[PDB]
Amino acid sequence: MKDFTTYLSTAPVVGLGWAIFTSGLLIEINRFFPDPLVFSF
Amino acid sequence: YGFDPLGLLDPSVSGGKGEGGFVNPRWLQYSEVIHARWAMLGAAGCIAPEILGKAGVIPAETAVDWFRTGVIPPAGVYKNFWADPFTLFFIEVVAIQFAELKRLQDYKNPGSQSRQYFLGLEGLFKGSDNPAYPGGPFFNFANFGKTEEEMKKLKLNEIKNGRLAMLAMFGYGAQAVITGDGPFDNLLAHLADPTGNNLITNLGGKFG
Amino acid sequence: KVKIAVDRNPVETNFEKWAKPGHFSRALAKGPNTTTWIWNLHADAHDFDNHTSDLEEISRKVFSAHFGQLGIILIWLSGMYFHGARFSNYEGWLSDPTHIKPSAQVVWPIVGQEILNGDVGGGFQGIQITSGFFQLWRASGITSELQLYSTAIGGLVLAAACFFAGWFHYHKAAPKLEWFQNVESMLNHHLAGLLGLGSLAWAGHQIHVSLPVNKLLDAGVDPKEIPLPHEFLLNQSIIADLYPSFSKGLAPFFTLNWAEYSDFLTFKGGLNPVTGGLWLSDTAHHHLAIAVLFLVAGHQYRTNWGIGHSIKDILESHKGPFTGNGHAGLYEILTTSWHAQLAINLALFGSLSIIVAHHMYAMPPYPYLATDYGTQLSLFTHHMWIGGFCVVGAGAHAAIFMVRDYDPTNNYNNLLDRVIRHRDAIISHLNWVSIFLGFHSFGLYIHNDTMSALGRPQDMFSDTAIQLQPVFAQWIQNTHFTAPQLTAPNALAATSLTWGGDVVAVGGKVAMMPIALGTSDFLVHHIHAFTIHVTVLILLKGVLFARSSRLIPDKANLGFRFPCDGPGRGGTCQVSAWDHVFLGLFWMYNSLSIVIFHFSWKMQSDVWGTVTDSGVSHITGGNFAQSANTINGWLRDFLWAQSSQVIQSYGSALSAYGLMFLGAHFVWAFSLMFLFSGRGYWQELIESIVWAHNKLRVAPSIQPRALSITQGRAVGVAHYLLGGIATTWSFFLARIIAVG
Amino acid sequence: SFIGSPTNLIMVSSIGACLFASRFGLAPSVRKVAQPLKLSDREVLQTTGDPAGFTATDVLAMGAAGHAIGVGIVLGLKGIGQL
Amino acid sequence: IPTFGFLYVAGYIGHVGRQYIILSKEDAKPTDKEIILDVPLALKLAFQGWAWPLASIQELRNGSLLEKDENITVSPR
Amino acid sequence: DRPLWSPGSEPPAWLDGSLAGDYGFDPLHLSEEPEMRKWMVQAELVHARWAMLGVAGILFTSIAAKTGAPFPDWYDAGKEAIKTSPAPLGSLIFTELLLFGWVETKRLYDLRNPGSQGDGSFLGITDGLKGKENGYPGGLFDPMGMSKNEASYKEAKVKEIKNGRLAMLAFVGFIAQHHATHKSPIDNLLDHVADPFHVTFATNGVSIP
Ligand code: CLA
Ligand code: CLA
Ligand code: CLA
Ligand code: CLA
Ligand code: CLA
Numbered sequence A: 001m002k003d004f005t006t007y008l009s010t011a012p013v014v015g016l017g018w019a020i021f022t023s024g025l026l027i028e029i030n031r032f033f034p035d036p037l038v039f040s041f
Numbered sequence B: 001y002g003f004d005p006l007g008l009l010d011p012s013v014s015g016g017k018g019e020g021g022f023v024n025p026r027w028l029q030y031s032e033v034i035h036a037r038w039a040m041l042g043a044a045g046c047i048a049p050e051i052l053g054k055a056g057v058i059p060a061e062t063a064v065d066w067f068r069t070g071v072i073p074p075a076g077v078y079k080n081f082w083a084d085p086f087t088l089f090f091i092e093v094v095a096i097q098f099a100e101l102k103r104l105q106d107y108k109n110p111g112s113q114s115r116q117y118f119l120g121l122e123g124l125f126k127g128s129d130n131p132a133y134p135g136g137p138f139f140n141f142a143n144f145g146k147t148e149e150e151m152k153k154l155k156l157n158e159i160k161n162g163r164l165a166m167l168a169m170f171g172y173g174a175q176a177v178i179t180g181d182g183p184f185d186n187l188l189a190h191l192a193d194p195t196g197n198n199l200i201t202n203l204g205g206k207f208g
Numbered sequence C: 001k002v003k004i005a006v007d008r009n010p011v012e013t014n015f016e017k018w019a020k021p022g023h024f025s026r027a028l029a030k031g032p033n034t035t036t037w038i039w040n041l042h043a044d045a046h047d048f049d050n051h052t053s054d055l056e057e058i059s060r061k062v063f064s065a066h067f068g069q070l071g072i073i074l075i076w077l078s079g080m081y082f083h084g085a086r087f088s089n090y091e092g093w094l095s096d097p098t099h100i101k102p103s104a105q106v107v108w109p110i111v112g113q114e115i116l117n118g119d120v121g122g123g124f125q126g127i128q129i130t131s132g133f134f135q136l137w138r139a140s141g142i143t144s145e146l147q148l149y150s151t152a153i154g155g156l157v158l159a160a161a162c163f164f165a166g167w168f169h170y171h172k173a174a175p176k177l178e179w180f181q182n183v184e185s186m187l188n189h190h191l192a193g194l195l196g197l198g199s200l201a202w203a204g205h206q207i208h209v210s211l212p213v214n215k216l217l218d219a220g221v222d223p224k225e226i227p228l229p230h231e232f233l234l235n236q237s238i239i240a241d242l243y244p245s246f247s248k249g250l251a252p253f254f255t256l257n258w259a260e261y262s263d264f265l266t267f268k269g270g271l272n273p274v275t276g277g278l279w280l281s282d283t284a285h286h287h288l289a290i291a292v293l294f295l296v297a298g299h300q301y302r303t304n305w306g307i308g309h310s311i312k313d314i315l316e317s318h319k320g321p322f323t324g325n326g327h328a329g330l331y332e333i334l335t336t337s338w339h340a341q342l343a344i345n346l347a348l349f350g351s352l353s354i355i356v357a358h359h360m361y362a363m364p365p366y367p368y369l370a371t372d373y374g375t376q377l378s379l380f381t382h383h384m385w386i387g388g389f390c391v392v393g394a395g396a397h398a399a400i401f402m403v404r405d406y407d408p409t410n411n412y413n414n415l416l417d418r419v420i421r422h423r424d425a426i427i428s429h430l431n432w433v434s435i436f437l438g439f440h441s442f443g444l445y446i447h448n449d450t451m452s453a454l455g456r457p458q459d460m461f462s463d464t465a466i467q468l469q470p471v472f473a474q475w476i477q478n479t480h481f482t483a484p485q486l487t488a489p490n491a492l493a494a495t496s497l498t499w500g501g502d503v504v505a506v507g508g509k510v511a512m513m514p515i516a517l518g519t520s521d522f523l524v525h526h527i528h529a530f531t532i533h534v535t536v537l538i539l540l541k542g543v544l545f546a547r548s549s550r551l552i553p554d555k556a557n558l559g560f561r562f563p564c565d566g567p568g569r570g571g572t573c574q575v576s577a578w579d580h581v582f583l584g585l586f587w588m589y590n591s592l593s594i595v596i597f598h599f600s601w602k603m604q605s606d607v608w609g610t611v612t613d614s615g616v617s618h619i620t621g622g623n624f625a626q627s628a629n630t631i632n633g634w635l636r637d638f639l640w641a642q643s644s645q646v647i648q649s650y651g652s653a654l655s656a657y658g659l660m661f662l663g664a665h666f667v668w669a670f671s672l673m674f675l676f677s678g679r680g681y682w683q684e685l686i687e688s689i690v691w692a693h694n695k696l697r698v699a700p701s702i703q704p705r706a707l708s709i710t711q712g713r714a715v716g717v718a719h720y721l722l723g724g725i726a727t728t729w730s731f732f733l734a735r736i737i738a739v740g
Numbered sequence D: 001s002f003i004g005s006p007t008n009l010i011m012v013s014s015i016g017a018c019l020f021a022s023r024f025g026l027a028p029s030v031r032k033v034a035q036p037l038k039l040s041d042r043e044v045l046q047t048t049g050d051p052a053g054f055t056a057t058d059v060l061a062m063g064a065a066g067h068a069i070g071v072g073i074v075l076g077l078k079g080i081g082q083l
Numbered sequence E: 001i002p003t004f005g006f007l008y009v010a011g012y013i014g015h016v017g018r019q020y021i022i023l024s025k026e027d028a029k030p031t032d033k034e035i036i037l038d039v040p041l042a043l044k045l046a047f048q049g050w051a052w053p054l055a056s057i058q059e060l061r062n063g064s065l066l067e068k069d070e071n072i073t074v075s076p077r
Numbered sequence F: 001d002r003p004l005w006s007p008g009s010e011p012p013a014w015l016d017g018s019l020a021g022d023y024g025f026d027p028l029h030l031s032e033e034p035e036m037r038k039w040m041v042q043a044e045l046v047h048a049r050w051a052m053l054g055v056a057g058i059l060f061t062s063i064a065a066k067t068g069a070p071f072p073d074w075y076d077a078g079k080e081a082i083k084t085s086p087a088p089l090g091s092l093i094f095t096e097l098l099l100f101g102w103v104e105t106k107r108l109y110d111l112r113n114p115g116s117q118g119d120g121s122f123l124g125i126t127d128g129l130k131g132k133e134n135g136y137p138g139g140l141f142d143p144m145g146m147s148k149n150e151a152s153y154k155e156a157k158v159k160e161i162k163n164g165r166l167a168m169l170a171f172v173g174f175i176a177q178h179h180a181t182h183k184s185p186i187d188n189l190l191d192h193v194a195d196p197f198h199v200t201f202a203t204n205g206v207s208i209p
């Protein structure tokens, strides 16, 4: 696991984990909430 | 017997370190005798209900062609069983997965199945130097093959009858697909009219 | 002599080399001091020649690389089958192929994408697909989505098996070098075994499965009550009524009475009028003949049993006097260089993909494929581009072999040495014929443009004015039309309706109609010949001058991919063979773009259209005959007369095609930054940005560096090709879906 | 393939001629490697019985050749108006 | 308000990147930390960047935000 | 040296037998690092205890429904429970979230720092709320306290982990044959003992096409 978790801390932790997290996050804000234009809380 | 035209028993094949690949003499002999014993059991069980059904030894309502017992439900499935064929399949999977995985674990480590407790059956599960030839208090429960000369004679006889059962099961499947009836029916057809009932005539017939 | 030489466990299976990304190269094994280390990591990743000098390790690496690519392709194919099984209207399309548009991709309702789920018919909404998978799944007998699910699961299982095979055949039991060097055994097993066995298996599947399903499908029988193919396989009675030859039951095969099989192994010309595709019996006899022809061809070479052909003997035996030594050292070259084999295989694969594109636009081999103009156009263009890319890669890897794997000691007076010897003559004559073709293929267009602009249409190179009639192509068309009459009397009709005289039409839309060739077709075909001649000139000059040149005699020691030799001798920029290939990508792009523009305009103006009771009306009113003689006519009547649906696609199902169009415009335009510019300006700008990040101490530990000159050229050509390909893709698909 | 049918006779004669030719030279067999005029009389494996290089691979190759030649002759004669 | 809403996240990203850059440059052979990320420390800085403007302001005030040109690579014009 | 998950196999080096239920089954090399080993042990024990609790509750409700009490199925029990619950949905889950946040942060910081919660910070409890082992607390969690004897404690550890793994398998079986049969687990058990030769996982229609 040590050798595997050393590899998993390379490019996919920043290129895939951040990308998937930020993407799917934003997808769910755009899904559960409709399309906004004015920040009226 | 020296019949190796292609060449797969060369020690130069799979040379080096590690557990390696399947093309090696040890695994080849192991799988040869395993295919031999399985083919002999299959050749016994394919034609054993047929002869006893023609002779009326066992009830003919149970005596059916080997491919119509439920192995190929397109060909036929026997309804009058104590369980559905898939239930028997799951029983088969559990039991023979246990058996073949114990065989594989002993193949990787010889004698290792006699160390881990298995219902007090570790005495039977030791094996010999050849993983193909375990022996012991169960696999050779009758001593029978004790002296090395008659042991090697029994080895040659077993491998020869298994090599015969290779072609026997091959012909069983081939006759089953070209004709659609049992192998003993094909034997009776060849005996009654050899020229009218052979390969040449049957290839130009129905269902083949 | 031929045996299975395998080394067991040469490489341990662990993640030790996964932790360190730079491990294949000793130069990249130290660390990423500069930002060019990452680009060198992703660039020299699969270059196995400089990883190690042993051919055995390279052979094992490429063997498992091919296994991984096979697993990836099987994963993608299984995914397509799963999409057809789950998100598709294939069941609806089977009951109405002429009125329901195919669809196999369903988007999510997340943000505005509900407009992309267009009304394709059959109570289904989704992306109108263009790969023609519904036509393929109608050719091979497939009725329900359950069979597609089973195919997808089997494809996933085979992909997992292929990946496990790559892992085993590299890490666990790796073959030796002599195993890979058994060329005769490889050729025999991939001629008789792979190609021949696959052709026989597909012929058997077509005979026992596809033929009855397709015979019941075009007869008006609903697919719900069509019997499953295992019923045809097991019961001879059901297959006997559709084909009476099955009642004999393999008797005519062994008695040489094959004429009795003339009901489902027919020899018919043209297309099936009900569906518009080729007859399935013709394809069955075709694949059976191909299987026989490849099975006899796979027993040619000598491997282990004395008989056969020795390839080295065949090569060394063909020696003709004007060539000195003939094929003397080619066997040793192709048994020791992976790159020469890669070049040959890539060239033939690309050419055969070109043949595939031509021979499936001409003869549609799938039911309801000719009337589906989008699938035919997309298939032709896609295999066009794949073949062109493979040919350019063949030139590239030939140049790589020339730089690296070439040795002058083995070959002295062979064909290859004499090819290097007279390379200046070849390049000069190719340049001459390239310039001649350019003048007498493009100055004709410019002259027609001028006389149109000078108000003199009678001076044109057109049909109404003085003309260049393609007499040879028309004569070949007439010969092939009259070929079933005399030279092939057993053929029912012509092999294709390109040269025929009948207009087949399915669902009121023209499946395939005869093609008339005129002056404009002559001009465009000679433009194609010019463009291909220039591209092959560039690629062959890159291959020939890769070793040495009159400018730089030591170009071999500089490697294959080097940016330049400095501004000496006036400036030797782009002198490497890699940059010759880099220009070849653009020239192949121009060639194939003009080719697919010709295809789209010619089909939409003279083949594709809707048949009426009073004549036949095309998609465009025959504008190719009177408008393809001038560049301005080409522009206005093809790129402006069309593409009006791409710009007006907003608010509709094809708005994503307009988005793809403008994004492709962006990517094509963004490439010219990497193409016109150099590295020093960008390096100085990066130095200023490094100063800016140094002022407030956000300097990265890895020093930011500009992209290399070869790296910059690669980025520029990749973005240029991506932008152009996606531009043509969006324009073609939107035009052919909104109209056809 | 009926006994006495002309196609049966043609393939029987073709297979017999292909087997009999390679028995005594007259063919590029296993023992006879082939030049443009097919010489040099080599030896590999064993004949297993009857003399002259003629093993299992030899009978398989020559039988395949004879079957192919007979099939070609039969279908050609069918095409050109004969049997 | 969405201007400050974007600026908060932008300063968050810049501040956590700066914190990772300083905390990586003080480590032996620091060039590998950019290609071989560490997840615990980057996540610790990721959940410590909420008060990015206060940390940026205090770092500007104490002078550790900026660096003396004397120690900055300067083009020789 | 000990019974393994496969007879004649090689146990992992990090699985030396010191843990409860250490049969050496680890083909994916998880819990190799000691910190990750402790985290995996804690996760296994908490998943185990929740599995035995949930399976026991499911079995009790199903048995009571079989006797004749108005008890729902193990599935959709909360759907009809909220209609008669004084606590509405939302408030219930957030109260559970707050309480479980307190408890699970306490036990997590006891896992990272052993004995950290036994400092008397929470209501002045020193000996209680202080961990005894990796995933095994003590004090207030051991009222009767039959874990004092080391041999009995080890035997109870092995019993707990084995019944817990059986509880994981029981919950997976519960959801699987509920999706297969749409009936209670006690209903499936009574159907299996009534007609064993025919009623099984193969003749339920679904899951075997
Ligand atoms: C590779 C392609 C392929 C395949 C798989 C088949 C398969 C089949 N064809 Mg077809 N056929 C093909 C190509 C193919 N054909 C071509 C190219 C033509 C020329 C046009 C034909 C023309 C044709 C006709 C005209 C007819 C068939 C028929 C048949 C069926 C009868 C089988 C038979 O005659 O031989 C089977 C004989 C054998 C000796 C095969 C032996 C194989 C068995 C399974 C071996 C089993 C051994 C096993 C290891 C031991 C048992 C295992 C146990 C444990 C389970 C069969 C399903 C007939 C049909 O439809 O009948 C229903 C029929 O009338 N075929
Ligand atoms: C008749 C036997 C046979 C067959 C069918 C094949 C088939 C193939 N070989 Mg070849 N090969 C053979 C014998 C054979 N080989 C021999 C004897 C040698 C040594 C002289 C080689 C040496 C060789 C090399 C060096 C390479 C291949 C490759 C390939 C693949 C080419 C890719 C392609 O066309 O897509 C067709 C793709 C498919 C049909 C997908 C299905 C693939 C299935 C799973 C493969 C099954 C065929 C296999 C021989 C079955 C036995 C394997 C068994 C141990 C399980 C193809 C699968 C390339 C490769 O690596 O790909 C694997 C490659 O680079 N071959
Ligand atoms: C049969 C297929 C085949 C095979 C086995 C090889 C194998 C090889 N080639 Mg060849 N090549 C091929 C086809 C093939 N090539 C084709 C078709 C072309 C024409 C484009 C080339 C052009 C080519 C050149 C010009 C060079 C090679 C080189 C190489 C070597 C290393 C390649 C590498 O590491 O790339 C690394 C892998 C990548 C960089 C990934 C590719 C990503 C590209 C740039 C973009 C793809 C984008 C995609 C299409 C769409 C995505 C859009 C985006 C928004 C996500 C290796 C010997 C190089 C070498 O040194 O040879 C010894 C070299 O200089 N090849
Ligand atoms: C459409 C844009 C375009 C055009 C027209 C040209 C034109 C040319 N390039 Mg180029 N090329 C271009 C873009 C273009 N390039 C780009 C972007 C690249 C980068 C990848 C290249 C890469 C490249 C390579 C790698 C090669 C060329 C070559 C050529 C020549 C081909 C000669 C030929 O057959 O054509 C015929 C000539 C023309 C089309 C020029 C216009 C002539 C018109 C019809 C007018 C006719 C003459 C006129 C009447 C006289 C007017 C007299 C007046 C002054 C009074 C020619 C000079 C090749 C070469 O050197 O020759 C084979 C070559 O090897 N180019
Ligand atoms: C987090 C690290 C970081 C920080 C604090 C800065 C800060 C700065 N950069 Mg730099 N930059 C970075 C990374 C960073 N950059 C990277 C990775 C690149 C390569 C794409 C650049 C490329 C770049 C250029 C080309 C320019 C700047 C400029 C600037 C200045 C303007 C502020 C701004 O938003 O620029 C805009 C910054 C970008 C567009 C880069 C965005 C890239 C992402 C957001 C950075 C990802 C880093 C990552 C999240 C950190 C890891 C987190 C950690 C927990 C693991 C400022 C001094 C400008 C300047 O000189 O003004 C004085 C300028 O012209 N930067």
Ligand code: SF4
Pocket: C563, C564, C565, C566, C567, C568, C571, C572, C573, C574, C678, C709
């Ligand atoms: S401009 Fe660039 S490619 Fe050209 S000679 Fe100078 S350094 Fe080399």
